[PDB]
Write a protein that binds this ligand. Structure first.
Ligand SMILES: CCCCCCCCCCCCCC(=O)SCCNC(=O)CCNC(=O)[C@H](O)C(C)(C)COP(=O)(O)OP(=O)(O)OC[C@H]1O[C@@H](n2cnc3c(N)ncnc32)[C@H](O)[C@@H]1OP(=O)(O)O
Ligand SMILES: CN(C)CCCN(C)c1nc(N(C)CCC#N)c2sccc2n1
Ligand SMILES: [Mg+2]
Length: 411
């Protein structure tokens, strides 16, 4: 069934997943010296290329591949259009490894055919709370605790093969070369997500959407007018009214995050994320990188009253190309990023996210039911979509956990 995935160190079935009781590696311990020094073999008409994702022109080359060949829906209505500024932000965090950005070009004329990217992340990925209780009940605490310490691993994203090269087994080659480059730096696990089901997720969550511009969403067929609104003389007027938001934030002391806020935002974020089984650990440099505002890319606000930051939220922008509409070329989506609330209920904090996103011309707010995202779904009028986001590890056995025990946002 899976000619490539069956050869890899990942749990092969749900049944296998059911028997996993402790976090730990799947594979034998290996050393850098055991890993081939030479790139993985590739057809003589192709070549490996490492783009410089801080150099405008290489960023643009990768941007065009993704613009034209990255994730699209099954009805080919929308295709993600991650911006050049977003890609530099996502792929070049503190201490990133340029070698983990891997491309294939056709040698002749240098057409770009494929990409995959890894970035470092420090992840808590030790045995989850409910399985540590089971271990305690059996006298197996030491085994369960072995990998409690946060680990420096690889996060993989942006796997893409050109549409003309699909179903030729190029993605496994990209994956094998990425793995080799990661292993050559003495890193042996990765974390990744996908909308598709592969062997075998450790967690899965539904996607949720919150309409900000329903007229546009219906025009481009992201949304339709729900059946219940047909009982009204003006269905669309009633739909617009249902999703109306304030024109300015409601929380006193909301303002954009600045450099001086990094220590307090790090503190409140890390205290919050500790509550979840799987989550990132961020240094001050990483809090700076992932949360300070970047035009067009990431938007972060703090609540500060009386000289103290007590809460914050962040969202990031991913537009999609709208394939063939005469009124609109783009869907402008805002995705819920990290947040922490200590002074107000989460729904009150995230309402301001929706208000700011709407004010800035976003059409929809998206999120997965990770973190405490379920706590404000109903009041804030999110609805489940048809997608799921599945969380995977490479070379890591891990008990199944609920998505409300995951605190890693994947871009
Ligand atoms: C220690 C360090 C380790 C680092 C590596 C960790 C692993 C990272 C793994 C990557 C995580 C990426 C996270 C993201 O970026 S998820 C985003 C993925 N990108 C897209 O969906 C963009 C649009 N589609 C494409 O570009 C192509 O269809 C892709 C490239 C997805 C496959 O190309 P193509 O359609 O031309 O197929 P093939 O003939 O070359 O290959 C077929 C094989 O590929 C397996 N396949 C299909 N889709 C995915 C998928 N999303 N993750 C993993 N495997 C996938 C499939 O089951 C089959 O294997 P098997 O069933 O036969 O066994
Ligand atoms: C790797 N990485 C995490 C990027 C996420 C891709 N983004 C932004 C995304 N992806 C969705 N799906 C793949 C659902 C597929 C299924 N089942 C959806 S569905 C609604 C928004 C949305 N956005
Ligand atoms: Mg292929």
């Amino acid at each position: 069934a899976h000619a490539f995935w069956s050869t890899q160190p990942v749990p092969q079935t749900e049944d296998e997943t059911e028997k996993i009781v402790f976090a730990g590696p799947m594979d034998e311990p290996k050393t850098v010296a055991d890993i081939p020094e030479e790139p993985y073999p590739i057809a003589s008409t192709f070549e490996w290329w490492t783009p410089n994702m801080e150099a405008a022109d290489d960023i643009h080359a990768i941007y065009e591949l993704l613009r034209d060949n990255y994730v699209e829906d099954d009805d080919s209505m929308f295709r993600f259009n991650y911006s050049e500024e977003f890609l530099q932000w996502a792929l070049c965090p503190p201490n990133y490894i340029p070698d983990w950005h891997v491309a294939v070009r056709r040698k002749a004329d240098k057409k770009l055919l494929a990409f995959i990217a890894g970035v470092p992340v420090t992840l808590r990925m030790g045995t989850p709370k409910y399985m540590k209780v089971k271990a305690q009940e059996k006298g197996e605490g030491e085994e369960a605790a072995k990998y409690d310490e946060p680990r420096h691993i690889c996060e993989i994203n942006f796997l893409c093969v050109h549409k003309q090269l699909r179903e030729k087994r190029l993605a496994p080659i990209l994956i094998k070369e990425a793995t080799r480059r990661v292993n050559r730096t003495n890193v042996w696990q990765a974390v990744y997500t996908a909308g598709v089901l592969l062997p075998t997720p450790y967690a899965s969550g539904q996607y949720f959407h919150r309409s900000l511009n329903p007229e546009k969403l219906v025009e481009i067929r992201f949304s339709g007018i729900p059946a219940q609104y047909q009982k009204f003389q003006n269905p669309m007027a009633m739909l617009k009214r249902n999703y109306q938001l304030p024109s300015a934030p409601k929380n006193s002391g909301l303002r954009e995050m600045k450099p001086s806020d990094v220590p307090q935002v790090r503190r409140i974020l890390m205290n919050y994320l500790d509550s979840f089984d799987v989550g990132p650990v961020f240094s001050d440099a990483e809090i700076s990188h992932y949360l300070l505002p970047r035009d067009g890319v990431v938007f972060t606000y703090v609540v500060e009253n009386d000289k103290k930051v007590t809460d914050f939220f962040s969202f990031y922008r991913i537009p999609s190309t709208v394939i063939g509409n005469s009124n609109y070329n783009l869907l402008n989506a805002a995705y819920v990023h990290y947040y922490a609330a200590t002074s107000i209920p989460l729904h009150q904090l995230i309402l301001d996210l929706l208000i700011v996103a709407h004010s800035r011309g976003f059409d929809v707010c998206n999120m997965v039911e990770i973190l405490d995202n379920r706590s404000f779904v109903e009041q804030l009028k999110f609805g489940a979509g048809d997608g799921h986001l599945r969380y995977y590890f490479y070379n890591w056995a891990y008990p199944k956990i609920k998505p409300s025990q995951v605190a890693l946002v994947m871009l």
